[PDB]
Amino acid sequence: SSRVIVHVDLDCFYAQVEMISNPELKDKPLGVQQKYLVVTCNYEARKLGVKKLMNVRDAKEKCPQLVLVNGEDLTRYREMSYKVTELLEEFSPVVERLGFDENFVDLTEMVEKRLQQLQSDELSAVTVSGHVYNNQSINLLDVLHIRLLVGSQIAAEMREAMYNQLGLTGCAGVASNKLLAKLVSGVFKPNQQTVLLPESCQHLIHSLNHIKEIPGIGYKTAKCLEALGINSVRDLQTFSPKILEKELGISVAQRIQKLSFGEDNSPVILSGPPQSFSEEDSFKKCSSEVEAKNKIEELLASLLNRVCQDGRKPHTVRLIIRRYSGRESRQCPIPSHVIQVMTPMVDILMKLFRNMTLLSVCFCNLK
Amino acid sequence: SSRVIVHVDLDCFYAQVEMISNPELKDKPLGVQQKYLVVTCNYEARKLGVKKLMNVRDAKEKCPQLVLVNGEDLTRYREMSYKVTELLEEFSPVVERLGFDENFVDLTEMVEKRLQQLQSDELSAVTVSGHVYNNQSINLLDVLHIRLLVGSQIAAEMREAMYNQLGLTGCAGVASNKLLAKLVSGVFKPNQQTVLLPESCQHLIHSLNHIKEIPGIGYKTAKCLEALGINSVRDLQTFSPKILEKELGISVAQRIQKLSFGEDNSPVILSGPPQSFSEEDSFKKCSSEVEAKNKIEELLASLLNRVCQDGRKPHTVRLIIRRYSGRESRQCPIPSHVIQVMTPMVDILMKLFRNMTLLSVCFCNLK
DNA sequence: AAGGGTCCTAGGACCCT
DNA sequence: AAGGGTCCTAGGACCCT
Ligand SMILES: [Mg+2]
Ligand SMILES: [Mg+2]
Ligand SMILES: [Mg+2]
Ligand SMILES: [Mg+2]
Ligand SMILES: [Mg+2]
Ligand SMILES: [Mg+2]
């Protein structure tokens, strides 16, 4: 019943990918740029005051020597992301992706199999790889402690393999569920790992300062929670369930209140191949024409190449737009005539366009 | 590439189920009642003027000796329905259900395998079972005609097996796709079958008188179509594609216009086990209390028994209501604590109720 | 005051760089 | 003027008795 979960989180992912391909960006403060936004930066630039999602203005003031490369084309980040998930899938096949740079793996089976190869005495010699959260003391007679320490050893092998085979560093957290694995992986955050023993779980959740730091509690849920006076993890833990249901719904209230205790029974899901392919472009009110069709060709061309490479065939297309002041969209199936190309696809999309600062196209429903 | 599809349509299904269980209703005009509505009747009662979906008032005027049994509890109809689909699944495993009394089967593989067991001469002796639509002449040298005639023989075996093994009669239509199979199965409608040869396809679609007779064109789409002056199959066939897209959407316009030509490339889908379980009750404004919770207990009890029997476990529940003058609903996941009961389920539903002539409960998301 | 089914759509919540 | 992802929800279209 008890699970050993690992969460793997790569260091400054986009920046790290760039530093690998142009080694002259090591040691130099590096920011990866997307339009007006420095979406991430390496640790050189972080020391200098640069931070993630910071206007390229504010950033090059804090670090005028900041080197900036353009990371709008996600292609290379996307491709490394899958090399990581595939490498982890070798350890155990059930790997759950979260964004491009995070993976969950359920090591429970792996941990148990390794423990069965051990023998009475060497059980006394199981050691931890990496940090133990809250410098908590290990009890080798606690079977849960032994399993999490074995988890931590698998985690160090994963991280070692990632570096040996892909040149990537990252952090890992080992805990009894996904929430806790993900919260603990970030405790020692540059290329290190941390294991959470059960006795320190409450210390972990109460170390957070705003309830939005809980994965699953986001921008809107946080704002609602404040409006009820809920600001700390303990506030949410102790707040009326009944009121929380009425004011948020029985699904949301129940789960986030569970999360507030560090409880999370969600299984690690095999993400497998993606469920969708999309390309976006944004622009400061730079489209007011039905000659926004030029923008939709490039988005298609990239998607069309990405589809051909995946091999599967999509059966639904969607067009998303953002009107200047909250997005609108229209989708429809992809004629079977097509599924087996530029010209017909553009016609569908422009009809979809006409039925309606950003344009996006998405292929989903892949077979 | 060419398909041989069969569509199977049981005769006066509910009524037929009732006549089997109480044989004294044979020969007597029988109507199956649901609230104020005679939802179907046997052919005795049809001769006498009784028709489907007719108020029990109008019906017992046309046939005061009309016997009425109550068919609100679908349990027995549902159970026979699956005995039919399972019987057909023996012929070929890919059977698509449509409602409780219709099934599609792709006989293409079966037809081809039987033709390979034949030998030059006996090919000259392939005959049709049942009607040929439009009394069209068979050409034994036309491979498409030979395959559809073999289809018709499989169809007669299916219908014979249905009667021998379940006591049920019905109609079958054999054609090159689902649209045409379903349209042709009803041509000779009491316990008979009909095969559609390709040359008569246009005669079949133009035999219809209102475009709503096309499966896929329903109440709303028909009303829209009229408002554009489209009233006949030929009107829809010849009407501007462009206008039809703008006025209905690129998905709907394109498919229904294809249907108007008798074209339908949709595959026969293996329906397999149901995707949802639901129970409804209606009442003439007979609920104005939070003591509509009594109505939700019975709906649950029936669903709960149905779930236990299926074996799988649902992960979503929905509550549907109809406010007296167009339905509203609320769903939420089913706590994992529960998935492994009356009391907690009722509490969820009444919360769902309170966030909001008919009450319904649905379990979906089965695993 | 039928009693069920199917799948699609547009939007919104969450997650990451 | 980021550029992507995931899944859930409420409603609506269709089909049948
Ligand atoms: Mg990360
Ligand atoms: Mg990271
Ligand atoms: Mg959060
Ligand atoms: Mg029928
Ligand atoms: Mg019927
Ligand atoms: Mg119709």
Name A237's Cβ contacts closer than 8 Å, sequence gap at least 6: A257, A260, A261
Name the residue type at position A44: E
Name A172's Cβ contacts closer than 8 Å, sequence gap at least 6: A6, A7, A8, A9, A130, A155, A156, A158, A159, A185, A193, A194
Alpha-carbon gap, residue A42 to A20, rounded angstroms: 12
**What tokens appear for A64 in the block?**
């005028």
Name B224's Cβ contacts closer than 8 Å, sequence gap at least 6: B247, B248
* C-beta atoms of B348 and A246 within 8 A: no
B280 CA to C4 C1' in angstroms comes to 8
Residues of B in contact with A177 (CB under 8 A): none
- Supply φ then ψ for residue A193, to 5 degrees: -140, 160
CB atoms within 10 A of CB A313: 16
CB pairs under 8 A between A and B: 28
Structural domain containing residue B264:
197-273
Assess whether B92 and B64 both reside in one domain: no
Assess whether A178 and A88 both reside in one domain: yes
Assess whether B157 and B140 both reside in one domain: yes
Closest to A18 (Cα-Cα) out of A83, A68, A90: A68
B362 CA to D8 C1' in angstroms comes to 16
Name A363's Cβ contacts closer than 8 Å, sequence gap at least 6: A276, A277, A278, A303, A307, A314, A316, A317, A334
CA distance A332 to chain B (A): 6
Are B66 and B28 a contacting pair, CB within 8 Å?
no
* C-beta atoms of B246 and A351 within 8 A: yes
- Ligand 2 centroid vs A8 CA: distance in angstroms? 9
Residues of A in contact with B242 (CB under 8 A): none
| Resolution of the entry in angstroms | 2.2
Are A56 and A33 a contacting pair, CB within 8 Å?
yes
Q: Which nucleotides of C are covered by protein (CB under 7 A)?
A: 1-17
What 3-state DSSP class applies to A325? coil
Residue of B nearest to A347 (CA): B250
Q: Which of A220, A241, A273 is the last residue of a domain?
A: A273
CATH of the domain at A162: 3.30.70.270
Name B287's Cβ contacts closer than 8 Å, sequence gap at least 6: B295, B357, B359
Assess whether B50 and B133 both reside in one domain: no
Q: Which of A180, A196, A212 is the last residue of a domain?
A: A196
Residue of A nearest to B255 (CA): A335
Q: Is A39 exposed, middle or buried (0-12, 13-18, 19+ CB in 10 A)?
A: middle
b/e per residue A168-177 (b: at least 16 CB within 10 A): bebbbbbbbb
Look at the block and give the residue holding tokens 């009809």. A351
Are A276 and A255 a contacting pair, CB within 8 Å?
no
A330 CA to D16 C1' in angstroms comes to 30
Look at the block and give the residue holding tokens 């299904």. B13
Alpha-carbon gap, residue A262 to B284, rounded angstroms: 48
- Supply φ then ψ for residue A352, to 5 degrees: -55, -45
Q: Is B10 annotated as a binding residue?
A: yes
- Gaps in chain A (C to N over 2.5 angstroms) fall after 325, 340, 356
Assess whether A280 and A324 both reside in one domain: yes
Assess whether B162 and B119 both reside in one domain: yes
Residues of A in contact with B352 (CB under 8 A): 250
Q: Which of B244, B273, B302 is the last residue of a domain?
A: B273
Find residue B70's DSSP bridge partners: B33
Alpha-carbon gap, residue A261 to A283, rounded angstroms: 42
Q: Is A263 exposed, middle or buried (0-12, 13-18, 19+ CB in 10 A)?
A: middle
Where is B34: in which H helix or E strand? strand B30-34
Assess whether B141 and B88 both reside in one domain: yes
Assess whether B79 and B192 both reside in one domain: yes
Q: Which nucleotide is nearest to B101 (CA to C1')?
A: D16
Query: What DSSP character marks residue B280?
Result: E
* C-beta atoms of B250 and A352 within 8 A: yes
- Ligand 4 centroid vs B103 CA: distance in angstroms? 9
Query: B153 to each of A167, B100, B150, B158, how far by Cα in Å?
Result: 65, 24, 5, 9
Alpha-carbon gap, residue B344 to B332, rounded angstroms: 13
Which residue's CA is nearest to the C1' of nucleotide D14? B216
Say how many CA atoms lie within 13 Å of B148 toward its Cβ. Answer: 33
Angle at B321 between CA B316 and CA B323, to 5 degrees: 160
- Ligand 4 centroid vs B170 CA: distance in angstroms? 9
Find residue B55's DSSP bridge partners: B37
Alpha-carbon gap, residue B140 to B122, rounded angstroms: 11
CATH of the domain at A41: 3.40.1170.60
- Tell me the residues of A at the B interface, defined by beta carbons under 8 Å apart: 245-246, 249-251, 254, 265, 332-333, 335-336, 348, 351-352, 354-355
CATH of the domain at B235: 1.10.150.20
* C-beta atoms of A333 and B251 within 8 A: yes
The side-by-side arrangement of strands in the sheet containing A328-333 is A276-282, A358-366, A314-322, A328-333
Q: Is A367 exposed, middle or buried (0-12, 13-18, 19+ CB in 10 A)?
A: exposed
For ligand 1, an ion, list residues with CB under 5 A: A 9, 101-102
A113 CA to D14 C1' in angstroms comes to 52
**Which is it for the CA torsion B246, B250, B255, B258, positive or negative?**
positive
Q: Is A52 exposed, middle or buried (0-12, 13-18, 19+ CB in 10 A)?
A: middle
Can you say whether residue A144 is alpha, beta or left, with left for phi > 0 and alpha for psi between -120 and 50 degrees?
alpha
**What tokens appear for B48 in the block?**
């006498």
Are A320 and A294 a contacting pair, CB within 8 Å?
no
What 3-state DSSP class applies to A99? coil
Assess whether A217 and A292 both reside in one domain: no
Tell me which residues of B are annotated as active site: 102
- The experimental technique behind this entry is X-ray
Assess whether B79 and B180 both reside in one domain: yes
B326 CA to D12 C1' in angstroms comes to 10
Q: Which nucleotide is nearest to B99 (CA to C1')?
A: D16
Number of domains in chain A: 4
Assess whether B51 and B29 both reside in one domain: yes
Q: Is B147 annotated as a binding residue?
A: no
Mutate to test the interface with A, among B248, B250, B317, B345 (most CBs of A within 10 A): B250
Q: Which nucleotides of D are covered by protein (CB under 7 A)?
A: 1-17
A226, A228, A229, A233: CA torsion to nearest 10: -70
Residues of B in contact with A332 (CB under 8 A): 249-251
CATH of the domain at A291: 3.30.1490.100
Assess whether A232 and A258 both reside in one domain: yes
What 3-state DSSP class applies to A322? strand
Where is B68: in which H helix or E strand? strand B67-70
